[PDB]
């Protein structure tokens, strides 16, 4: 099941930024469910919402920026707007609210782990996290970076924490063609097979060698390979034999 | 372009306002025609399916297709030979066949489109945001047209409702589906169909496809299952700033039957559907295709038969000409539904300032 | 914050306050409880009113309109977005401000609508509506030339009162039956009918017929009219012949009986269309041909 609230309270405040997601227009204008202060609905009038076709758009599925005017912290009353909001920080709230849906995608492994409350789950999170640093998809690289934010709390399920680390956490092909006609032989294979490693190395049938080497970041792969093939080339024109690289 | 004319039958000394006859068969296509288009109209020119609405989406598709198709040039610019491109293709889909107020406006709104968007500016860039806004338009003015259509017919339709429609309104036929399957009601739905088009035809077998209770319909009579009728849609195509509408087949005698017996009748339509332009007759502006609907003896359109029906020119002297499209009347539909939810075919022009 | 109550207290007043008015009054008060500025409070709240309204409703639609009209007015009066006191004011003051506009609509109606009387011209008024009486009334001070006519009405004897009120005039009084009115079509000159109710183009609510009517006077080639002050503008149309919410159950082919228990049944609302009238009297200056649709479509936007 998909609740709890965003931030540490239930009710937003006075020019604070949220995101909307529009289900229903006319009449009123728009009653309508926030992704970044509760699933609650928040309410904007026939006015707010529009500056500049205005009824052709806006039904399900489109997000609107809009500031909180009034709030009623008694039963359940948010009012909203949309003409307040310039296109100065605008970029910034998307960013912001970007981050706040990475953090809840984040929180979705604890929930189906162990068959739990989530809005439980999300608090016992956001007690190191959303707390003291700040915003938590930050403190999040932090940790998995260098372990510095879950230090604060203990953990009721390492294993998920694992998990959600390894979560959170390029194969090049080479091909070698072996046809001796010297003396020794199978040394010599060995000899080479040494050469190019390092790292995993799988045999097929009998003439060809593949090797499959790990990039570090993206570009590099002919700096090993390369020299592995001379060397290979090196070791077996001595003797009176033969190979081959296509 | 390529080749004109050269074309038998007479000129006819009764109805003449448009001009009769064309490209079918392909000899000598030029470079840089795109292939989508001249498909296009070859379906056109034996078409069954297409009526109005889906036939402006699909060009809509096949230019987003040539804009996908087409980068900017090193020697002319992007706005340089674009339009005239553009024009000949209009001109092509005019020789084929005549065409609907729905593609002029689209085709209005595409050339707006290009004289907002400088030339200096970032070539992928532009294209990149051009294509999401034409995305936009299409589900804004077709789509979401749509479904403000359906939402007006569901406050206003009665607890289970026996419904009578002409044509391929592609539009209503959706609706029809829906009232069937989404919201569950009883579907009582009677189409009638005439003899040059089997559309009222398809859209039974469609019906049945779902699994809809179809009264299937022709020429000779329609009083017979009236005299029970209780509410009726006509089939649509355009719309006048007169009140009036131009329309396909008999659905104006259906729509005078309507008047005369019981209860008037009601159209649905898009936003974009209305014109500027105005007439009141079936004389004004004629719809033409090939005698040769009617000379195939009945039943299936491809058969090749040895009998007794050819003659256009062999015998002494006989004509065999007829009408697609024709003059519905304006007291009798008082309804007209669009993205502007209500109003009335009186207020023949009311949305046209508003856009 | 209470509405039956309020409708229980109006029913057969109306006379010095129009009956919609006091409801308009009411709703205006109701809102000026939760705060205007609190959309989140106060919208829902209007909703639920109209609801209550709705079901406290048999044969009206003409509540509901007002209501709607409150709620256009209201969504109109934040378009300012500067200071939010001064539009919850003029919002707080907009409701006794109705009920005074309606005597200046009043006094604007015996300016512009007494220029139509003529030389021997028979005037037969329909419904209850008390603006169309009013000009009357106004037309009868002036003295031009003329004839007042009422009708066999039948809700809870509407007609006998109408005919009973005239009689206080002194005007000379004969009566029209619902069925006898099929004679009329020359002698009395122009058919006037009162409205309680005025929709997108040409639709009107009155009372137990005016299709008919409108038929007639068609048939005849006869000015047709449609009579009223200012507070009911709808966003309606029906489909058929005749389409409305109703209380009193159309074609209803009463049970099988010996003794008599329930059998007044049938259409007890008409509706008229675009084509049969001819003139549209109300006191926003001098419109006609389809004005109320274009004032309808430049405040919804919808």
């Given at each position: ?101 990475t953090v809840h995608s984040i929180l ?139 | ?39 296009l109209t070859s379906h056109l020119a ?310 | ?106 006094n604007k109606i015996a300016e512009i ?190």
């Open positions: 099941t998909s609740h709890c609230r965003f931030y540490e309270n239930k009710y937003p405040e006075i020019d604070d930024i949220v995101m909307v997601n529009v289900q229903q227009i006319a009449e009123m204008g728009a009653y309508v469910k926030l992704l970044e202060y509760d699933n609650i609905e928040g309410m904007i009038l026939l006015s707010e919402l529009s500056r500049r076709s205005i009824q052709k758009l806006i039904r399900v599925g489109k997000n609107d920026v809009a500031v909180v005017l009034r709030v009623d912290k008694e039963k359940g009353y948010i009012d909203l707007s949309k003409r307040r909001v310039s296109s100065e920080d605008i970029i910034k709230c998307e960013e912001k609210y970007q981050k706040s849906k979705r492994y604890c929930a189906e782990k162990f068959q739990i409350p989530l809005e439980e789950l999300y608090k016992t999170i956001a007690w190191p996290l959303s707390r003291k640093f700040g915003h938590a998809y930050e403190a999040f690289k932090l940790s998995i970076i260098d372990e510095t934010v879950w230090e604060g709390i203990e953990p009721p399920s390492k294993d998920v924490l694992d998990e959600l680390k390894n979560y959170i956490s390029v194969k090049i092909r080479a091909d070698v063609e072996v046809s001796c006609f010297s003396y020794e032989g199978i040394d010599a294979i060995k000899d080479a097979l040494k050469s190019a490693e390092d790292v995993k190395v799988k045999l097929v049938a009998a003439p060809l060698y593949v090797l499959t080497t790990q990039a570090l970041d993206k570009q590099k792969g002919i700096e090993q390979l390369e020299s592995a093939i001379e060397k290979i080339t090196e070791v077996i024109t001595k003797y009176g034999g033969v190979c081959n690289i296509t | 372009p390529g080749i004109s004319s050269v074309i038998p039958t007479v000129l006819e000394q009764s109805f003449d306002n448009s001009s009769l006859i064309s490209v079918k068969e392909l000899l000598l296509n030029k470079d840089l025609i795109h292939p989508s288009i001249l498909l034996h078409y069954k399916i297409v009526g109005s609405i889906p036939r402006c989406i699909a060009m809509l598709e096949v230019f987003q297709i040539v804009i996908k198709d087409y980068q900017t040039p090193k020697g002319t610019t992007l706005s340089r030979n674009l339009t005239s491109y553009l024009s000949h293709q209009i001109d092509l889909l005019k020789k084929a066949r005549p065409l609907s107020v729905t593609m002029g406006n689209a085709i209005r709104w595409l050339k707006q489109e290009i004289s907002l968007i400088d030339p200096s500016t970032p070539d992928k860039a532009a294209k990149k945001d051009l294509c999401e806004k034409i995305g936009q338009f299409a589900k804004e003015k077709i789509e979401l047209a749509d479904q403000l259509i359906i939402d007006n017919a569901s406050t206003q339709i009665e607890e289970s409702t026996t419904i009578v429609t002409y044509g391929s309104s592609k539009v209503l036929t959706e609706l029809l589906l829906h009232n069937a399957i989404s919201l569950k009601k009883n579907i009582k739905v009677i189409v009638v169909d005439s003899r040059p088009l089997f559309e009222g035809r398809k859209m039974a077998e469609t019906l049945r496809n779902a699994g809809v209770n179809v009264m299937y319909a022709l020429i000779t009579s329609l009083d017979t299952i009236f005299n029970d009728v209780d509410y009726v849609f006509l089939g649509a195509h355009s719309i006048l700033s007169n009140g009036f509408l131009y329309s396909r087949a008999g659905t104006a005698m259906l729509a005078m039957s309507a008047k005369r017996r019981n209860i008037p009748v009601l159209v649905c339509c898009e936003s974009l559907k209305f014109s500027q332009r105005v007439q009141l007759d079936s004389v004004t502006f004629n719809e033409l295709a090939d005698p040769n609907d009617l000379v195939n003896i009945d039943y299936e359109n491809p058969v090749e038969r040895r009998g007794n029906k050819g003659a256009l020119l062999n015998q002494f002297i006989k004509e065999r000409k007829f009408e697609k499209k024709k003059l519905a009347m304006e007291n009798k539909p008082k309804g007209n539904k669009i993205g502007g939810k209500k109003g009335s075919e009186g207020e023949s022009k009311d949305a046209s300032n508003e856009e | 914050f209470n509405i039956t109550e309020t409708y229980l207290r109006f029913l057969e007043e109306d006379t010095e306050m129009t009956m919609p008015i006091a409801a308009i009054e009411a709703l205006v008060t109701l809102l000026r409880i939760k705060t205007p500025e609190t959309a989140a409070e106060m919208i829902n709240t209007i909703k639920s009113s109209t609801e209550e309204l709705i079901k406290s409703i048999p044969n009206s639609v003409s509540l509901r309109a007002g209501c709607d009209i409150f709620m256009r007015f209201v969504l109109r009066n934040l378009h300012l977005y500067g200071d939010w006191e001064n539009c919850k004011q003029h919002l707080i003051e907009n409701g006794q401000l109705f009920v005074s506009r309606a005597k200046k609509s009043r609508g007494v220029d139509f009387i003529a030389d021997d011209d028979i005037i037969l008024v329909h419904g209850y509506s008390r603006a169309v009486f009013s000009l009357l009334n106004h037309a009868a001070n002036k003295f031009i030339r003329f004839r007042c006519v009422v009708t066999e009405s039948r809700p809870s004897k509407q007609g006998n009162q109408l005919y009973t009120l005239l009689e206080q005039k002194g005007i000379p009084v004969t009566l029209i039956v619902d069925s006898a009115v099929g004679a009329v079509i020359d002698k009395v000159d122009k058919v006037f009918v009162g409205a309680e109710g005025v929709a997108e183009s040409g639709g009107i609510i009155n009372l137990v017929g005016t299709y008919s009517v409108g038929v007639l006077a068609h048939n005849a080639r006869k000015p047709f009219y449609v009579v009223t002050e200012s507070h009911k503008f709808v966003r309606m149309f029906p489909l058929s012949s005749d389409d409305l919410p109703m209380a009193g159950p159309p074609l209803d082919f009463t049970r099988r009986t010996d003794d008599l228990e329930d059998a007044l049944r049938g259409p007890t609302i008409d509706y008229t269309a675009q084509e049969y009238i001819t003139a549209l009297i109300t006191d926003l200056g001098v419109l006609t041909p389809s004005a109320v649709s274009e004032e309808l479509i430049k405040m919804w936007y919808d």
